Amino acid sequence: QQQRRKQLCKEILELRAELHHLQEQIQTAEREIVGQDLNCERAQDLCRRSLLLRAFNKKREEECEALCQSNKKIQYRCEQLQEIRRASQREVMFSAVDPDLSSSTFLEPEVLRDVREVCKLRFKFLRSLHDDSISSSVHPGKEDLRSLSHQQWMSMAEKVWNTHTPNHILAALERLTLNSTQELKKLQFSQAADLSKGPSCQLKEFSLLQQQQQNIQEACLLLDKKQKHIQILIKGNSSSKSQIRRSSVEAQKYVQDKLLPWPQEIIQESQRLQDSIQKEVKHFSAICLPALLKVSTDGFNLLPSRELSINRMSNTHAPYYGIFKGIYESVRLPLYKAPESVLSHVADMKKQLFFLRSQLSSRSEAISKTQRALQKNTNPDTDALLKSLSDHYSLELDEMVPKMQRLIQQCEKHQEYGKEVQATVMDWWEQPVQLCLPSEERGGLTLRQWRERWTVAVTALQRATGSRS
Amino acid sequence: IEKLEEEVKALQKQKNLHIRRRNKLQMVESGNRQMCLKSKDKEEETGRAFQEVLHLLRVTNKKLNHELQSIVNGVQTLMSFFSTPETACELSSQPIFLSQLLLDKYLSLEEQSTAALTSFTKEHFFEGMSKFVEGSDENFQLVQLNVNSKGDYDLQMAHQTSCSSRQDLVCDHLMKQKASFELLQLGYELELRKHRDVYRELGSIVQELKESGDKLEERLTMLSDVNLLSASKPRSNIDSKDLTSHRLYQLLDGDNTQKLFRTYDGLESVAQKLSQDIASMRDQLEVSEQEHSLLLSKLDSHLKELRDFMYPEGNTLMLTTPELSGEFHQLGSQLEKLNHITVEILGDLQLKRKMLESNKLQQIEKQLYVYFFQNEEQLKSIVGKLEAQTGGGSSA
Amino acid sequence: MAQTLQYVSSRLSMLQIDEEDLERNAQFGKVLIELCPLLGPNGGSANLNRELEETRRELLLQRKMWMRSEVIYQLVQEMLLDLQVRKLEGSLTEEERKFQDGLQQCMLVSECSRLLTADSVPPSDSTSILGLDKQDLLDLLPPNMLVLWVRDRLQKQLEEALKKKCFTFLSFHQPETDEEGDVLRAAKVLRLASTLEDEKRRLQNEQEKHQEMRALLEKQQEIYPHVLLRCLSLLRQAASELRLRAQSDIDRINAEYLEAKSNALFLKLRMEELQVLTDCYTPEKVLVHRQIRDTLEAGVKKEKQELST
Amino acid sequence: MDEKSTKIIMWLKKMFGDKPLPPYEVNTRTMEILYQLAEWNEARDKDLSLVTEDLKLKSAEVKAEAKYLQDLLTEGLGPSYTNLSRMGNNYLNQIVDSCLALELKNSSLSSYIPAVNDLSSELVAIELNNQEMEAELTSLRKKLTEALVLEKSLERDLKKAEEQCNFEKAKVEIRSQNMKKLKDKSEEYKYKIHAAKDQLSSAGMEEPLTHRSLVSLSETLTELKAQSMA
């Protein structure tokens, strides 16, 4: 399959690069997406400020409305008072008395008439008490009718004080005193004249002996009872007049002591609530809305939500954003991984190191052991040993082999030489030189003839015995 | 191949997944880019809305300031009605209130009216009443008559009757004066009551602002709370509040000491250092594998060289050269041939020496030409001699 | 001993140890085998590992509760954003504007309500922020009948948003589901959680397997140089003791022996040769030979003169 | 040896409680190994303690936050978010379940999309690295087996070689002895070769006085005679 296999391995390497190229394109888009996150938290804070401030505004408007109402109440007192003051400043012409004329009119004002009526009703009530005092006793039963005239008196009285200004009333009363006094002055003048004379010129103006005498005694008694009534009435007015003077000083002290310190205190309190909206709104525009958002992690303790360690990376606008992004790259953790994995990951990092450390220690030992064993196991060095093998090899071809071929050759020559030596034995035994004589005779016999004689001679010797060799 | 074919299939399905996720990813990217733009527009829109509510609040502040001022103005205007004179710049004005007015004048008039009644009671009634009937502070007070002071009797009665009428007149006059006082004294009481109401009113109004102020001061401190306010810069010091940064720093540096030298900058530094440490340890193990790879490549190179040198093609551990081993067997064989040749020669040689020892006639045979060349007589003798021992030929 | 080594090396990766260590301290190996169950494969002690696994499950549990509310919360944020963008393009129905207005206002109103509502119990004696309360905020929320209409509507919008959010999830993990029938897609959503869990667990197992194979490769690498050194040691023994010492001596003695043997046999032959010449060629015979030789030479001379002439 | 020894006895006491220690043999090596083990174990015991206490805090912050989104929702949405159909709930649980598995720091798509991408990319990378690492293991397994096959092949071949060398040496002892003798035999022969030569040359020994030359002289004499006549 080798060629198809090579083609497929190429296709895999080619595919792996392409997956990588796609993966790099995905990574680049992911990085832009992480950077492109929703925080609309800035905008939402601003929406929150608008709503908080709308609600705030309504609450302050409610406060304003309370103050408007307070201002109206003070404005009503001030209006009543400005009109009473204005009315008091006028001239009041009263009904004339010269007692010289009774053909004189000025009209009586209402203040005068209304004051004449309430004083007249009370005069009548005082007169019923008086009339009783001469007929000596308060009888029962007129006491209830009396309460009721007192209530009417109060009512005409409450009306006189509210409708008319105090200076006008006072003045009407002043005049009332004068008129009543004038009635006194007419009685004074007519009667004064008589006093240089006789007291019997007083019988011009309002005008058995034992029986007359009694009538004079009873008449003295009558004068005593009227004199006494005058004494209680004079002493009663003297207390009343005094009591008016005390009531004025007491009232004046109260006006001075009680009402006058108030404005400074109102000025103090008023300055404080001047610009409340502006002090508050100024601090609020500086404020941070998630810091106002409180969470309790004990059931008790409110801590600002932003100050939790879990929220630092959710928020891009947090100041710890930079610190905790940096913690993520340093501990080598993805841009989406839960905050809780940083600490477990650091323990894993410490573990990971101890693992690399041990493999390095183990490997260094494996390398060292092999190097010490290579040195012990070499006597001499492998490079020396390889040269020595090669020297010994080159030497067998050069010395040992050629010497052998020389010796093989030498044995073949000796072997051949041995055959020649047999030829030498054969000539020695047979001696063929004997046949080399052509016809040479000595003693007129050839060597052949001598030999034949010899052979024949040995054979005759052998024959005669019955031997042979 | 089956495994490669599945891998090509697998990588291809992955390829197909990444094309599809990527196209969606282009969609999501463009879309988030659109959101990023919209959110910047939302912060601007929201800033505008906010500025309007603050404008509404600028009017409300002005209004409030105005009402506060009215209250100051209102109270300022109110107190002037409660003035006794120290003008004479104005003699146009008079006070309202009865107690604020000069009662000296009315009281003096009442004091003259009493004086007019006193002068009257004194002048027409008997001399004898001089004891005190004169008056003045407020004019004051009548003591009783001597009354006693046929024709004589009738006269006495006439005088008495004149005193009876004159006393009735005094009595009505005092009673009119009493009514006048009674109105007036009640007039101070109705006024005090109005005065009391002002006192009460100002206290309620003042109390409302006082409470409002207290609530205000609580608020003014509260919003100015620095922890509630927007943040400072990052620190360079590990914040005390955060227990997490301290555990993390501890875990990494191997602190369990209380330092004071817990810095963010330090924290990051030791974290990066550890990551660096892991990369170094990995790099060193890689260097150690390469050293190990050199050591093995050397032993293997050694091993092929040594095996190839001892072995002739890979067959067997041969020592000897084939050529030399073959020669040694071949030479030995030549030597064994060579012994035989030797043995042959000596065997023939031995036999022939044994013959010359056994027959003398045969030694002599081989000697005949020696005798031929040297002594013809000796040849004749010896040959003659063998014939002589055992008869020869003759012819005659 | 091989078992103990594998058991300790697989469970605790932080020890370089070999079999020789165990051999020399027979009892120590028993000690090592016992310490592994009291540790774990993590290096942490057994108690600590149990506690860690117990806190993780409990944390995951609370984390699931936060996450159910969190999905819903996020779906609303996404919804309000969606409808608001659509409001700006002028591509929003009137009903959606009402839905949007009611729903936005409700979230701002709850968000500002949550700022006030204190996990403590304020005193009377404390101001809340800006002097307000929840009721001041509900006053600015639109009339209850619109609120009720949005809420009735929200369950259906929420279900569409969930369906969509789950489909999206499905679309990225498994792009294959977008080309499926409606029945098949309903099945595939049901498998979405399980399938992603299987891929993660597989990645973790794949990591465990890498570490296991990493140990094996390193252990095989320990034995392998040691075998290469023995094979060399044997070759070195062959080379040294046999080829260079013994064989050179062997080769020397054989070559010399074979020469000595050849020369000796030759000389022996030569002596027996000389014995033969002495017996054949005595001075007497030689004198006689000289005479025969002269007789043939003299004859040869007579014929030569006659041939020449 | 004594500071290390104390830490190790205590650490070991830490492991077994108030129980006996298992006997072992004392030497340097065993302590050094025990010391690395004790070190790993202590470092991790600290680490796991620190991690557990954070996880307890995180659960409480998360719970606190959970209560906060739940409250936010009750107030904002009313009760209607809790009403869903069965299929609504299933879709929800899956969303939540995908989020818990990929350990997202919220439910946003911006986080979710990188998580799927990273999980797939890593899973394929670890798997491919694991395949390549199996093939290499297997290759190294053949190399080790092959190497071992050579060691035994070498034992056998060395052993046959040793037998050959032992045979050759034994023969070399006989040959070495036979050679010394052969040199001696040669020296003896040589003196006898000169003594004989001296008589033989003095005896007038020469080549034309031999049988072979003399027969050669005789055949030439007959042949020459024929020419001479012709």
PDB file of C-alpha atoms in Angstrom, chain A residues 428-429, chain B residues 345-358:
ATOM      1  CA  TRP A 428      71.195 -46.743  -9.781  1.00  0.00           C
ATOM      2  CA  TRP A 429      69.614 -50.152  -9.559  1.00  0.00           C
TER       3      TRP A 429
ATOM      4  CA  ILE B 345      60.750 -43.585  -2.341  1.00  0.00           C
ATOM      5  CA  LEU B 346      62.015 -45.002   0.910  1.00  0.00           C
ATOM      6  CA  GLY B 347      59.948 -48.185   0.478  1.00  0.00           C
ATOM      7  CA  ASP B 348      61.545 -49.035  -2.957  1.00  0.00           C
ATOM      8  CA  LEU B 349      64.886 -47.925  -1.575  1.00  0.00           C
ATOM      9  CA  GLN B 350      64.840 -50.292   1.476  1.00  0.00           C
ATOM     10  CA  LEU B 351      63.797 -53.237  -0.630  1.00  0.00           C
ATOM     11  CA  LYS B 352      66.702 -52.792  -3.095  1.00  0.00           C
ATOM     12  CA  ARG B 353      69.305 -52.440  -0.226  1.00  0.00           C
ATOM     13  CA  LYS B 354      67.861 -55.780   1.204  1.00  0.00           C
ATOM     14  CA  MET B 355      68.525 -57.484  -2.197  1.00  0.00           C
ATOM     15  CA  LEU B 356      72.239 -56.474  -2.427  1.00  0.00           C
ATOM     16  CA  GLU B 357      72.642 -57.807   1.090  1.00  0.00           C
ATOM     17  CA  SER B 358      70.905 -61.085   0.226  1.00  0.00           C
TER      18      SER B 358
END
